[PDB]
Design a binder for this molecule. Structure first.
Ligand SMILES: [Mg+2]
Ligand SMILES: [Zn+2]
Ligand SMILES: [Zn+2]
Ligand SMILES: [Zn+2]
Lengths: 533, 133, 113, 84, 97, 66, 196, 263, 61, 49, 140
RNA sequence: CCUGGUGUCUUGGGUG
């Protein structure tokens, strides 16, 4: 009840997705805005505006709920039948409904870092779901599968100014954890911006007009097309740079490429115009030294927050007018690479058999600090991992540029190399407690095998992939591995929470004073200068 | 009325990873040590090997907001085929005869390697390229 | 509980106009037309017809949110032609084309019957 | 006794984010309770907007008392603190 | 060389061994052999290694403050009820843990 | 429970093709042939009759309360 | 039936949803990004089998560890007039223009869980309080308030907003005026307001 | 200028091809036919006795999806625009359904043919249910056993498909164009070949295939669009097309009138 | 107001012809909870019809 | 259910042992604190009378 | 019948086809294990069906061998919260909370075990036409 | 004619 009590003026419901909103905006339902109220003081510049809210009532939005005088007596508008004979005086208070441009605090349990509590502007929206921007999902660590988030409304004037000038969303772009931004373009927005910035992307004037009109910060001047004859066609790089403010330079060399850029790598942005370089995760991502950090350091928080919405709207319109999907055929390879994968698996099995023969004949080299069995298991695991990596690399090189899985992997929004390796090539070796499948039975792992069987297929080596078909033994091994991983996660989350709680309780009275020193509550000097600089 | 005009013979054409954008490499016939590596389109201007193209680089098409071309006015693009406009993003001051100019047209890259007496007037902010035949 | 009414998607209130016009002082001869209780059906049909006109220099439309039945169109013509007269001529041309199409469809159905 | 003279002030002359937010909140709370505005009010009638306009014009009659860990304090006027 | 076990006092005195660059992973023995200034550096190095093993990166100021708080009273102060509650702070703050 | 009236996808009236479907099934015809005989070329309407589970027959087995 | 849970983001009408060449509109639209990371090839296999069964006229046997392959189903799907991989050319429901990338289309079995929006929405401004601590109660059926745990307090401390944290635990909570003596320092002060 | 070429026409569905038009115009016409077409469906269900195994709201929703004849719905006024008090004979259709099974053995299946039209705006052919022939029972509604009566009153009003999908006259409207992909508006996903792994459309024999040595026409525009409009029996295909054209023309006229009155 | 908690029909507006119950009657704008949906709406006084002993009597009841 | 309680550490009675083949379900298990403890019998499982 | 202890001294075979040696090269189907460690195997038992190793909630998952273990666990845990027809006498029962689906439809990709679970007769779901695409960004 | 009251402790399964 003291370190953690229950407060009033708080709402909690499931959130939703809405890329058509700003970075510092949250969609509040009608019933939630009608239930919550804010007490505004009756002044000489808003009494005529408050009279309309009083005449409206608590059942009509926008309206009022209670009227408080200077003594403390509250007038309930639900039972007051004489609402038309109520005059407002200077110094009173009116509990008005939650309207627009109202900074409110937003949180989601658990609150790990300081970015979990953010001040957002209320926007009245229908339905009963909170509408959030698709860029604040990274610091919130939330998704749209059943995420209930909490919203608190201040009840004073100083708290509103504090939340607007301190806990504002554009002010929480750069995080002091690793001097890098925490919000970036991900998901379908990243997948669309990876394809729009291609070299073979050409848009017609009819679509270019609509894409330029979708920019709220557009100056109203249409840029010249890259091709004038025989048909005016624009490139996605120009329409992306249109939303980028001028006076922004960024040079990034990837792989040591030259200025000709044969692989279309790197990144060159001069005067807010992207010269060359495909925009992906290494540009508009959450990494340090990108375009977001450059804009934040050059212009400010407002321009950086507006650029997020502009890029989001542009990429969403381009993807809606273009399209992206995935299918089963995107995970099926040809008959030429499957044979190579099978040959590599057979070679790995032959190498494992040779290692077994060498270990069973006293012809295996002993590793420094490890016994015979430990070194043998380590060598087998390393060989299996190398074979799986080679098979995955071959399967990835077999994929073409038009593959949706390869595009999603190269975009960086979702998927990786191990995903393609496990979906097309080979799953890999199932590890349990750092080692392989232990002999749960009598000198064996399953009753379908013989005793003293050190073969990969009898120790948790899923040869087939998810597309081919997992054998019952491989299925049981994968189930055991998944159960072990889930149990380890569910056990370690509580330990990490306890560690964080202990660290917070140990470091909570530390504050930098005006003399530059770093002292606690007792006055003892911990550091003569914060960060020694 | 133009800044540079030459006739380049295409030597190598590489489609690369894109099916529409192709990189063409050409060398001038009247003067050596002058190379042109330019990204062009295939569906709008199909090229081939050993093809002579008249390349003209200028700064203006007159004989800021874009507008549809009216059928009553005339310009320099009325006598050419592949017309493009871009911005120069590099002006390398090499060793006399070795001077490289890098231009970008919305992403399409063009590298022009030549001397000083032929590229001293190409130090502009924007460039219009016209390819004929 | 909080689901809005469906009939409000096409019913215009008494204090809300159907067509709003606002001037754009940033560029000469440019207007912003706000359409209420409409969808993409008339929007695209007007946008393409205005883009198919030589006197129209810029024409675009966009819906701020699909939950609200309204959209906004930017129209910027030249100095001689007024965007309002251009939109009226485009509407008249679309009406004439639809009348001709209906007449041809009726004439074809009279033979197919 | 605990007051440091104006010629011996060693604190920073710039306004921090916390001090600026506190000043803005105090000014808005005072204006909301019918206070004589030192600047002209045009279309912006919100208390926070008026406070921001007064802060941008350096017309806020308030003094920040920055406290020192030893017990002393320094009084810095809002009309002399450089605001970015 | 990498030697299992902790015995810096007897290892540093071995001839042919650089008695000025020998590092130990246990800060408890470092506090007794070298001092608190070397213990702070060892703790910071261990924390940085633990953080960067998984590719993560944390600013230097946070780890510096963390290793300076534990090395403020002269000895190693644990992050438990034995080292935190043994301070001269208020009772209402110490009873909240 | 009961056969739906309109198709969930498009909206074709499929509520009047259940008795005829059962009669065609009683004659030994396959499910695909019975669905093709009812002029159901789209699978969206075929899934409304092939994957339908009639449960009102089991609910009618209970005696009425009134 | 593969762990792909999701909430409804928006609702579109019939004229706004995309359509293929036969005029079939999707009853639901999912995200492709939830496919390569979670590795749900079984979902695509089940969708393809359901499409093949709906085209032919029978229920496919989804029994694991059988001889059913992907090519055998793709051959039967291609022999019916459709694509082998289930791809269909869908059009845009806004302008009618063709989509450059094909869209996976087909029937899939879904289920509605007990978690809904109307059963989790809660809001309270000034409701009933407890008797022991005079604090807001706990529970949705009792009109309670949200809990401000220690993590929220630490996050507010890290933000530097002291006034907000002070008001959240006083004016917007359970404040009370007590009287103390200037000598004893205890709360044993008998006070009378109407008699002053 | 726009020409119409009807390929197939009957009573329910009609397949044709539209030429000399625009893609946006065809999309707008399809959207109008799928939504902006006023019909007639049951809007109110008064239940006086329901002792069946189904729920009351279940039977109401089942009745709301019953298509009714709306051939004379243009002269019918909306319920929200009627100046009269409550329901009358100019904006509402009244029907009654009374069913009762007598006997200790059997099951009476209540079909859509039991909907008897009580009143209506005479003598307009509206309110009657849609039937295929003369002996068809119709759509199944409920099944009554022993001592199970069902007495219901249906009140149908005029509405469009924008408020509820039950007012949509069309079910599945197929629409396509360019079977050979001459405009290059899409990218065919393939594994070895794109011409063999992709089936041909049903209108591939109506257009000539592109030549292998034919240059790409960048000035080409979509001209021919094949559209098959199907109905649910509540309205005819030609009637639906004419009503959609009339609704689009009325919307355009209202926009033009508002533009002229804004000055 | 002797019109609270009474069956009332609607004669004009969008919900023309719907049953409801007068949940709150503060003045002019009556709060009516309808029977078909699960919501309460405010409605003007000239848009209601109160029941009695013979049909639905308007304001003359 | 295994009467062990939420008290404890490691994952000895929670991990899926190899002897659980054909007796209990290798996938059906609760999430949270009862993960690995509460199990469900297979489709062909039987208890001795 | 064999228990956990008797299974330690027996040799079980997965499929009956593995009881005899065969005489392929299919790039689409799975690869069977080689089992070249032992010269000759002496099988004493044979499994009736491998798909029977799953439980009740796991038998509803179509093709569980092509999914992940966490996804299968999540599906088995969420299957107990699907809305459907729990009993045929719901009109006479007065349970505290009951949820009944409107139009229960049987899945197209069913398993044989469902024939013993009454899933095709009392389903809890619907066969909806799902499309995988990125529309207006409202499905991310 | 204002003012206004339904609760403390547990057991089992789920949500992020
Ligand atoms: Mg989640
Ligand atoms: Zn259908
Ligand atoms: Zn005292
Ligand atoms: Zn009437």
């Amino acid at each position: 009840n003291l370190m953690g009590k229950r407060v009033d003026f708080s709402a909690r419901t499931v959130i939703s997705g809405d890329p058509n909103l700003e970075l510092d905006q949250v969609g509040v339902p009608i019933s939630i805005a009608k239930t919550l109220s804010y007490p505004e003081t009756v002044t000489q510049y808003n009494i005529h505006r408050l009279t309309e809210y009083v005449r409206n009532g608590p059942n009509e939005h926008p309206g009022a709920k209670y009227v408080i005088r200077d003594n403390g007596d509250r007038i309930d508008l639900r039972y007051h039948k004489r609402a038309g004979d109520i005059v407002l005086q200077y110094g009173w208070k009116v509990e008005r409904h939650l309207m627009d441009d109202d900074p409110v605090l937003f949180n989601r349990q658990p609150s790990l870092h300081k970015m979990s509590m953010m001040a957002h502007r209320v926007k009245v929206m229908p339905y009963s779901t909170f509408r959030l921007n698709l860029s604040v999902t990274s610091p919130y660590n939330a998704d749209f599968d059943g995420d209930e988030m909490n919203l608190h409304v201040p009840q004073s004037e100083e708290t509103r100014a504090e939340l607007s000038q301190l806990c504002a969303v554009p002010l929480q772009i750069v995080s002091p954890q690793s001097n890098k931004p925490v919000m970036g373009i991900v998901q379908d927005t990243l997948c669309g911006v990876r394809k729009m910035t291609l070299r073979d992307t050409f848009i017609e004037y009819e679509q270019v007009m609509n894409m330029l009109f979708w920019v709220p910060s557009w100056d109203g001047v249409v840029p010249q097309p890259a091709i004038l004859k025989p048909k005016p066609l624009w490139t996605g790089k120009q329409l992306l740079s249109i939303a980028i403010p001028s006076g922004i330079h960024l040079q990034r060399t990837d792989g040591g490429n030259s200025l000709l850029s044969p692989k279309d790598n790197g990144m060159l942005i001069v005067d807010g115009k992207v010269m060359f370089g495909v925009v992906d995760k290494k540009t508009v991502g959450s990494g340090g030294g990108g375009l977001i950090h450059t804009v934040m350091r050059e212009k400010g928080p407002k321009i950086c927050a507006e650029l997020f919405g502009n890029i989001q709207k542009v990429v969403n319109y381009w993807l809606l007018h273009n399209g992206f999907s995935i299918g089963i055929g995107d995970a099926i390879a040809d008959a030429s690479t499957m044979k190579e994968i099978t040959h590599a698996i057979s070679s790995a099995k032959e190498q494992v058999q040779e290692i077994i023969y060498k270990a069973q004949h006293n012809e295996l080299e002993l590793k420094p600090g490890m016994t015979l069995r430990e070194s043998f298991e380590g060598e087998v695991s390393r060989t299996l991992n190398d074979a799986r990596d080679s098979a995955g690399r071959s399967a990835e090189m077999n994929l073409k540029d038009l593959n949706n899985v390869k595009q999603m992997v190269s975009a960086g929004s979702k998927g990786s190399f191990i995903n393609i390796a496990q979906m097309s090539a080979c799953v890999g070796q199932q590890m349990v407690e750092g080692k392989r499948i232990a002999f749960g039975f009598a000198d064996r792992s399953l009753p379908h095998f013989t005793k003293d069987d050190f073969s990969p297929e009898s120790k948790g080596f899923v040869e087939n992939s998810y597309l081919r078909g997992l054998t019952p033994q491989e299925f049981f091994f994968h189930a055991m591995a998944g159960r072990e991983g889930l149990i380890d996660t569910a056990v370690k989350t509580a330990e990490t929470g306890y560690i964080q709680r202990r660290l917070v309780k140990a470091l909570e009275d530390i504050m930098v004073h005006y003399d530059g020193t770093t002292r606690n509550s007792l006055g003892d000097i911990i550091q003569f200068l914060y960060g020694e600089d | 009325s133009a800044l540079f005009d030459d006739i380049f013979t295409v030597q190598t054409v590489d489609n690369g990873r894109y099916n529409k954008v192709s990189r063409i490499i050409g060398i001038s016939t009247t003067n050596s040590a002058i190379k042109l590596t330019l990204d062009i389109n295939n569906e709008m201007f199909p090229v081939s090997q050993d093809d002579s193209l008249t390349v003209t680089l200028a700064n203006s098409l007159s004989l800021k907001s874009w507008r549809p071309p009216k059928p009553t006015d005339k310009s320099l693009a009325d006598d050419y085929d592949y017309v493009m406009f871009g911005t120069v993003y590099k002006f390398e001051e090499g060793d006399e005869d070795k001077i490289k100019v890098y231009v970008s047209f919305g992403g399409l890259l063009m590298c022009l390697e030549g001397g000083y007496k032929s590229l001293a007037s190409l130090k502009q902010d924007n460039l219009y390229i016209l390819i004929r035949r | 509980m909080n689901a809005p009414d469906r009939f409000e998607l096409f019913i215009l209130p008494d204090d809300v106009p159907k067509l709003k016009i606002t001037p754009d002082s940033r560029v000469p001869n440019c207007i912003i037309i706000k359409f209420e209780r409409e969808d993409h059906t008339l929007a695209n049909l007007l946008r393409e017809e205005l883009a198919l006109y030589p006197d129209v220099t810029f024409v675009a439309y966009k819906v701020e949110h699909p939950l609200f039945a309204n959209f906004v169109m930017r129209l910027q013509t030249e100095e001689g032609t007024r965007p309002k007269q251009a939109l009226e001529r485009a509407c008249a041309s679309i009406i004439n084309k639809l009348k001709t199409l209906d007449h041809k469809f009726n004439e074809e159905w009279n033979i197919k019957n | 006794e605990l007051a440091i003279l104006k010629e011996e002030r060693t604190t920073t002359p710039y306004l921090t984010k916390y001090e600026r937010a506190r000043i803005l909140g105090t000014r808005a709370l005072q204006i909301s309770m019918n206070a004589p505005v030192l600047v002209d009010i045009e279309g912006e009638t919100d208390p926070l907007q008026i406070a921001m306009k007064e802060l941008s014009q350096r017309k806020i009659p308030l003094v920040i008392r920055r406290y020192l860990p030893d017990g002393s304090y320094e009084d810095w006027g809002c009309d002399e603190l450089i605001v970015d | 060389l990498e030697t299992d076990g902790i015995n810096l006092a007897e290892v540093m005195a071995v001839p042919g061994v650089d008695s000025s660059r020998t590092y130990s992973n246990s800060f408890v023995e470092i506090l007794s052999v070298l001092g608190i200034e070397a213990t702070r550096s060892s703790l910071y190095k261990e924390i940085l290694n633990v953080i960067a093993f998984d590719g993560s990166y944390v600013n230097y100021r946070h780890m510096a403050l963390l290793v300076d708080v534990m090395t403020s009273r002269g000895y190693l102060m644990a992050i438990t009820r034995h080292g935190i509650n043994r301070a001269d702070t208020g009772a209402l703050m110490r009873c909240s843990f | 429970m009961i056969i739906p009236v309109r198709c969930f996808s498009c909206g074709k009236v499929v509520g009047d093709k259940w008795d005829a479907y059962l009669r065609l099934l009683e004659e030994g015809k396959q499910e695909g042939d019975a669905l093709d005989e009812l002029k159901l070329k789209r699978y969206c309407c075929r899934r409304m009759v092939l994957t339908h589970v009639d449960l009102i027959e089991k609910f009618l087995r209970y005696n009425p309360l009134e | 039936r593969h762990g792909q849970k999701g909430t409804i983001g928006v609702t579109y009408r019939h004229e706004d949803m995309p359509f293929s060449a036969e005029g079939i509109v999707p009853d639901l639209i999912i995200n492709p990004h939830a496919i390569p990371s979670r590795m749900t090839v079984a979902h695509l296999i089940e969708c393809l089998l359901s499409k093949v069964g709906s085209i032919r006229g029978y229920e496919g046997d989804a029994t694991p560890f059988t001889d059913l392959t992907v090519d055998a189903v793709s051959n039967l799907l291609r022999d019916n007039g459709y694509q082998s991989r289930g791809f269909e050319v869908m059009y845009n429901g806004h302008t009618g223009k063709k989509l450059m990338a094909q869209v996976f289309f087909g029937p899939t079995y879904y289920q509605r869980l007990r978690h809904m929006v109307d059963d989790k929405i809660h809001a309270r401004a000034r409701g009933p309080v407890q008797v022991l601590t005079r604090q807001p109660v706990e529970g949705r059926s009792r009109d309670g308030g949200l809990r401000f745990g220690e993590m929220e307090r630490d996050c507010m401390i890290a933000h530097g907003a002291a006034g907000f944290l002070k008001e959240r635990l006083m004016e917007a909570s359970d404040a009370f005026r007590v009287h103390v003596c200037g000598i004893c320092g205890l709360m044993s002060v008998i006070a009378n307001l109407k008699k002053n | 200028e726009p020409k119409v070429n009807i390929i197939n026409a009957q009573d329910d569905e009609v397949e044709l091809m539209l030429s000399d038009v625009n893609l946006s115009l065809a999309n707008s016409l399809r959207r109008t036919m799928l939504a902006e077409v006023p019909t007639l469906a049951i809007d109110l269900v008064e239940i006086k006795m329901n002792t069946s195994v189904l729920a009351d709201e279940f039977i109401s929703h089942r009745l709301g999806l019953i298509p009714l004849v709306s051939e004379d719905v243009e002269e019918m006024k909306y319920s929200r625009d009627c100046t009269c008090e409550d329901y009358c004979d100019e904006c509402s259709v009244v029907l009654e359904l009374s069913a009762r099974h007598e006997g200790e053995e059997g099951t009476t299946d209540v079909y859509s043919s039991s909907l008897i039209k009580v009143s209506g705006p005479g003598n307009l052919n509206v309110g009657e249910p849609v039937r295929r022939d003369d002996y068809d029972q119709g759509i199944l509604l409920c099944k009554l056993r022993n001592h199970q009566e069902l007495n219901i009153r249906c009140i149908a009003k005029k509405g469009i498909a924008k408020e509820h999908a039950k007012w949509s006259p069309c079910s599945a409207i197929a629409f396509e164009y360019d079977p050979h992909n001459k405009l290059k508006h899409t990218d065919f996903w393939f594994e070895v070949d794109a011409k063999k792994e992709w089936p041909d459309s049903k209108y591939a024999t109506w257009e000539e295939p592109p030549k292998p040595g034919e240059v790409f026409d960048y000035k080409a525009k979509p001209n021919r669009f094949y559209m098959t409009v199907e109905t649910t029996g509540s309205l005819k295909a030609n009637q639906v097309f004419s009503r959609g054209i009339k609704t689009l023309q009325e919307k355009l006229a209202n926009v033009l009138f508002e533009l002229e009155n804004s000055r | 107001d002797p019109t609270l908690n009474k069956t009332v029909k609607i004669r004009q507006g969008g919900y023309k012809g719907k049953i409801g119950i007068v949940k709150e009657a503060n003045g002019d704008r009556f709060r009516v909870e309808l029977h078909n949906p699960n919501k309460t709406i405010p409605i003007p006084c000239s848009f209601l019809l109160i029941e009695s002993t013979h049909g639905w009597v308007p304001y003359e009841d | 259910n295994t009467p062990i309680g939420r008290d404890g550490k490691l994952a000895k009675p929670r991990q899926l042992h190899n002897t659980h083949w054909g007796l209990v379900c290798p996938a059906e298990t609760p999430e949270g604190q009862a993960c690995g403890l509460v199990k469900n019998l297979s489709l062909l499982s039987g208890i001795s009378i | 019948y064999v228990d956990g202890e008797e299974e330690e001294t027996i040799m079980i075979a997965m499929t009956p086809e593995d009881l005899q040696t065969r005489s392929l090269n299919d790039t689409a189907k799975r690869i069977k294990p080689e089992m070249s460690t032992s010269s000759h195997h002496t099988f004493t038992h044979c499994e009736i069906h491998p798909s029977m190793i799953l439980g009740v909630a796991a038998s509803i998952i179509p093709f569980p061998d092509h999914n992940q273990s966490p996804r299968n666990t999540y599906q088995s845990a969420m299957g107990k919260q699907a809305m459907g027809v729990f009993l045929t006498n719901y009109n006479v029962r007065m349970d505290t909370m009951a949820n009944i689906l409107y139009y229960p439809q049987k899945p197209l990709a069913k398993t044989q075990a469902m024939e013993y679970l009454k899933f095709r007769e009392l389903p809890a779901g619907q066969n909806a036409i799902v499309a995988i695409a990125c529309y207006s960004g409202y499905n991310q």
